[PDB]
């Protein structure tokens, strides 16, 4: 997991194509001077908090920062379920919609959102999630954070988000992560709609 | 005084749910009243632990004791290795005579009936009714309220104004319907006939007929296979209701008294 201070600078990670196939020194970076980059994940939006959760190989990776510090952690827990996706952190939520760059087909985006209200494990809210133009398979995780990292409890699977009408009862105050796997690329942006009732 | 007894464990939250060992797999569930070997458990007790173990009388898997699984809170019943997690303190709430079953391995947790998932769990002690249970002898459980005595095959004893004992083939008639109820004051059963508002006898020979504050109208059912039962009268305690001469005729007047373990003296009790 790669992030920045307060997650504010949204970084974009690339993999150097054909790196690690040549000279290597154990424990040290071997600059291959390869400028052919294969995009992995990231957002170009300047003011949009997001952190990257990417699988990396013992290969050269570039991290692009737009116009502070960069923190790398080696997640080994349930966060592995968010492989190769940027986690757009939603904080303005309080019929909200968030428009981000649409990932390619079979590539993942993730939205981490906190249901408004006070948590008491009894009060819920009917939350409906749906895209606007791009069909994608949805997945929902409940988030529980310990000192060792983050734990994700699977909630649903195989959700058709393209103009979906199904609603799900989610506890107020709890944190959820929606992992969308874009299956149909009918637009350049994905506009995910979170509607609260 | 429940050492080595065959019981059923009803749920105090819903008196129509029973400990039911699902045939096939080993899961225990809260099923409706099925008066057979699946809802029947033995309470053989360990003197060196002051705790009980709850064996099951599933015929095709004899050694199957109630078990608490792992640090999970499930109660699947498996083979008896006499492990610590397989014993259960049987505390009795003196008021209302319900029970609390607390795991011997960790007696901070007690049996909890979901009644929404129809299975059991381990909860912490509450003031609710989902941790109370009713353990009782199966003969009491399956006959405290029941509604067809069939001599050992397809013919059933019956009774409007001709009140007596007969034997005609099953007809789903109102004269061929017997409802058994139990009185835990004389500790005795009665067989009402579901045609009017109790058999009295042993007070001109047999003269078994349906009619009082008389001990004649009281019977004790004692199992003999466990699915066949003998019926003794609470007048002499040695008179057993039987058939006449072991005749399988469809007019036979069933009689009473004596014993000798004759096949005419046993009965396969009602089956709805």
């Amino acid at each position: 997991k790669i992030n920045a201070q307060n997650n504010l600078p949204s970084l974009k990670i690339y993999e150097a194509i054909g790196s690690g196939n040549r000279n290597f020194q154990s424990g040290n970076l071997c600059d291959d001077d390869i400028k052919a980059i294969n995009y992995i994940t990231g957002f170009d939006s300047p003011n949009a908090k997001s952190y990257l959760v990417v699988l990396l190989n013992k290969k050269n990776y570039y991290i692009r920062v737009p116009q502070n510090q960069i923190k790398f952690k080696r997640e080994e827990g349930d966060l592995r379920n968010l492989m190769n996706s940027s986690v757009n952190i939603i904080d303005n939520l309080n019929a909200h919609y968030y428009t981000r760059q649409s990932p390619d087909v079979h590539d993942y985006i993730s939205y981490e959102f906190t249901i408004p209200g006070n948590f008491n494990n009894k009060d819920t809210s009917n939350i409906r999630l749906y895209t606007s133009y791009n069909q994608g398979i949805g997945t929902l995780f409940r988030v529980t954070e310990t000192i060792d990292g983050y734990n994700l409890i699977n909630i649903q699977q195989n959700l058709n988000l393209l103009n979906s009408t199904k609603s799900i009862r989610l506890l107020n105050g709890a944190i959820y992560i929606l992992k969308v796997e874009v299956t149909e690329l009918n637009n350049y942006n994905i506009k995910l709609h979170i509607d609260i009732t | 005084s429940l050492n080595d007894k065959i019981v059923t464990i009803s749920c105090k939250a819903n008196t129509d749910l029973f400990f039911y060992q699902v045939p096939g797999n080993g899961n225990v569930s809260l099923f409706q009243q099925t008066r057979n070997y699946l809802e029947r458990w033995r309470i053989i007790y360990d003197s060196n632990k002051a705790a009980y173990k709850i064996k099951s009388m599933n015929i095709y898997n004899t050694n199957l004791v109630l078990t608490w699984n792992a640090p999970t809170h499930n109660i699947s019943a498996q083979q008896d290795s006499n492990a610590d997690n397989q014993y259960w303190l049987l505390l009795k709430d003196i008021g209302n005579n319900s029970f609390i079953i607390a795991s011997y391995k960790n007696p901070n947790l007690v049996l909890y009936a979901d009644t929404v998932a129809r299975n059991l769990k381990l909860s912490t002690l509450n003031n609710s009714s989902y941790i109370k249970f009713i353990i009782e002898d199966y003969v009491i459980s399956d006959f405290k309220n029941f509604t067809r005595i069939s001599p050992i095959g397809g013919k059933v004893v019956q009774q409007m104004t001709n009140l007596a004992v007969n034997l005609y083939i099953w007809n789903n008639d109102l004269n061929q319907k017997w409802t058994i109820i139990y009185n835990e004051e004389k500790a005795a059963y009665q067989f009402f006939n579901k045609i009017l508002s109790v058999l009295t006898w042993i007070f001109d020979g047999n003269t078994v007929r349906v009619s009082q504050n008389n001990d004649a109208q009281y019977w004790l059912i004692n199992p003999v296979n466990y699915d066949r039962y003998t019926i003794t009268n609470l007048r002499d305690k040695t008179k057993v209701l039987d058939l006449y001469g072991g005749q399988t005729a469809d007019g036979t007047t069933i009689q009473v008294f004596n014993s000798n373990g004759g096949d005419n003296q046993i009965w396969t009790m009602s089956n709805p």
């Binding site: 008491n120 494990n121 529980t144 310990t146 000192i147 709890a174 | 912490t124």
Partner: protein, 138 residues
């Protein structure tokens, strides 16, 4: 520094918002607001064993611990928080008591925790409403 930062907190139950953790007579209960220093708790993350130490600010050199009777008390001689919602934790035990995770537990009658000690009881999942505690930073 993002997950339970070191500092000072008020501990409440999800059952009430006006009751704070107060150490009365060697047992911890939840009592009305007193605007005093006995209802605040200093949380420090000890990394030598990766655990959390809660102390009473009004009475330092005392640490929250569990005695042999199942209560929770303040000693002078190990906790594992896990977060399930915004400012909401279930305080677990770094030591597996009887090979099973034990956690803080408070009992309630129709959601009323008045005059009830804080105990340590077995934990199974994150869905027990009785074991939920809000650590509001102060």
């Amino acid at each position: 520094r993002t997950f339970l930062p070191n500092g000072n907190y008020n501990i409440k139950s999800i059952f009430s918002g006006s009751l704070y953790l107060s150490p009365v007579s060697g047992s911890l209960t939840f009592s009305n607001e007193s605007s005093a220093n006995n209802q605040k708790w200093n949380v420090e993350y000890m990394a030598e064993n990766r655990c959390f130490k809660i102390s009473n600010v009004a009475e330092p050199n005392k640490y929250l611990s569990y005695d042999n009777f199942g209560f929770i008390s303040l000693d002078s001689l190990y906790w594992f928080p896990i977060k399930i919602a915004v400012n909401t934790y279930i305080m677990l035990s770094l030591n597996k008591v009887n090979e099973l995770d034990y956690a803080w537990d408070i009992y309630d009658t129709n959601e009323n925790i008045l005059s009830q000690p804080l105990l340590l009881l077995p934990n199974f999942d994150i869905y027990n409403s009785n074991q939920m505690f809000k650590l509001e930073k102060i």
